[PDB]
Amino acid sequence: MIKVLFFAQVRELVGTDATEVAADFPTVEALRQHMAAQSDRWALALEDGKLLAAVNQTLVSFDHPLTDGDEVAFFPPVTGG
């Protein structure tokens, strides 16, 4: 399967820290669209123009391909330092 993690405001709005999805999506963007379509709260959390994505702990474009066993994360602009 594919494991999906959420952080900060995104985590708060989707209402869970982590979930699993079958490996039936060609890219990060296709997965994002599928998850946004689950509810009005999930759409608000995941349709933001500034949303960031990581695959296997590296920042990537939303066009990045997906593979069975990957860890994907969705989160807002960062504020460290």
Binding site: L5, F7, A8, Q9, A54, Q57, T58, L59, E71, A73, F75, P76, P77, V78, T79, G80, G81
Partner: protein, 142 residues
């Protein structure tokens, strides 16, 4: 040509980190940056499986852009208060220009790519700190 990367709640001491950073005779120019929390407490949420990896990937890119010697990057997590030290970046090179430029680059990329989020405990409740457009523009110049 070693690199030290640390992410954790413990305080750090510039006096304890400097001797290792500056030890090699070939590393003739040494630059450090320390950033502090800028009265409400802050808490730092983070992505544990990625914070050390993201910092290492920024230093790897810096090493391909400039000829660097020893490098150290430390970032804290947990509850912190105004005046507490949150981040340390130490870089070395043969000449000052490369050491200063690499220090600036590492901080600009850390502030736009490393997965940390600040939340402030105000009198009316917790509030997420806002990301700044000035940090986006600073990072885009590299």
């Amino acid at each position: 040509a070693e690199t030290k990367i640390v992410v954790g709640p413990q305080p750090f001491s510039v006096g304890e980190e400097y001797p290792w950073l500056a030890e090699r005779d070939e590393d003739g120019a040494v630059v450090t940056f320390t950033g502090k929390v800028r009265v409400n407490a802050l808490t730092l949420e983070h992505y544990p499986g990625m914070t050390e990896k993201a910092l290492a990937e920024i230093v790897d890119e810096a090493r391909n852009r400039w000829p660097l010697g020893r490098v150290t990057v430390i970032h804290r997590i947990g509850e912190l208060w105004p005046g507490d030290e949150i981040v340390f970046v130490g870089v070395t090179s043969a000449h000052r220009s490369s050491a200063f430029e690499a220090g600036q680059f590492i901080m600009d990329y850390l502030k736009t790519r490393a997965p940390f989020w600040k939340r402030e405990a105000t009198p009316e409740g917790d509030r997420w700190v806002e990301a700044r457009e000035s940090d986006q523009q600073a990072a885009k110049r590299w």
